Design a protein around this ligand. Structure first.
Ligand code: FES
Ligand code: FES
Ligand SMILES: [K+]
Ligand SMILES: [K+]
Ligand code: NI
Ligand code: NI
Lengths: 198, 198
């Protein structure tokens, strides 16, 4: 089971406007490996990337032994033509269920001051920060490096999807923000990569 | 089957020396999820990161239904405490087999001029360029973005491990250098991300 072809085109209007952006989208895969049941979960900013991404996804291809439901990706667009497609985890809410995920208030303590936003319980800290237009560090986006490291000051997180931290570090409050969901209101100090690996 | 804890520490001597680096290492996983049969494949530069990485890997943890052989990761160390662990694909050669993989000459045509090095048939273009001390762009390292894009001018590649390019783009000569192996001598123009997604 794996992706074969997942091309995304860069919308010329975004390029022209000098807009960076982000789409999170859910889809199913058929036993033939084609993509259907596509639903945009979020698009930042709105009306620039979503429609084009859905069009592109019609031509995606996977290899699979059976249909697969409720896949989710993040599609990030940055300056100078950069696009990346990152796999995330589907939830009841991503699949299109009735009602809204519980959401919690995230307080980030950043080198340039504090910021606060809502984060659904099925969205990673990083993603919700990006949706609020905050620029947090990252590189792998796969819970497998130090880039997105922060320190949890209060509250509780689910970091089941991370892997670069050991037991000890999690217990000491370390967080990989690309792979962590809030399960309460939380306060996280960001930009702590260098402190993590020291 | 998945990684749970893969902590790597930053060697203080590397920090002090202002050295960036890279280790590629093979290991097996036990049915208990512990790591054994560890062998460094390459370390750049030598004698700075390898021994410490092997020590760290003794404490790694996986979840698994059965033992798994001949896993390989790349471990990259950059300035300001950055470490990332990226999964790659094992080969006869990574497992420790007799004799050497066939190797091919890679010619890179970079914005700052041309460079040439050997690349084994079981090592990705990006990795071999990094081992030769060339700084090529990348971000996901998972064949799922535009960052490492180049244009294949001559020769042939295996890009089975990539997924962001479609059929058409591969046929036109596009290459994701983080996920491409040479199967002949090749010439690749690098730094073509913006041209790819345009
Ligand atoms: S960006 Fe690598 S662990 Fe979050
Ligand atoms: S770095 Fe993303 S495809 Fe190579
Ligand atoms: K379905
Ligand atoms: K073994
Ligand atoms: Ni613990
Ligand atoms: Ni073709």
């Amino acid at each position: 089971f794996r992706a074969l072809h997942r091309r995304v085109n860069y919308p010329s209007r975004a390029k022209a406007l000098g807009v960076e952006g982000k789409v999170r989208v859910k889809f199913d895969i058929t036993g033939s490996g084609t993509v259907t049941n596509v639903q945009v979960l979020s698009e930042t900013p709105d009306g620039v990337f979503g429609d084009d991404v859905v069009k592109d996804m019609a031509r995606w291809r996977y290899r699979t032994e059976a249909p697969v439901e409720n896949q989710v990706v993040s599609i990030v667009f940055k300056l100078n033509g950069h696009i990346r497609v990152d796999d995330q985890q589907g939830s009841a809410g991503s699949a299109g269920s009735a009602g809204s995920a519980a959401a919690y208030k995230v307080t980030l303590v950043t080198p340039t001051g504090n910021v606060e936003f809502q984060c659904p319980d099925d969205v990673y800290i990083l993603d919700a920060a990006e949706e609020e237009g905050i620029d947090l560090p990252y590189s792998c986006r796969a819970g497998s490096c130090s880039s997105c490291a922060g320190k949890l000051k209060t509250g509780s997180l689910n970091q089941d999807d991370q892997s670069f931290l050991d037991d000890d570090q999690i217990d000491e409050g370390w967080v990989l923000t690309c792979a962590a969901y809030p399960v309460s209101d939380v306060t996280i100090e960001t930009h702590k990569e260098e402190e993590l690996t020291a």
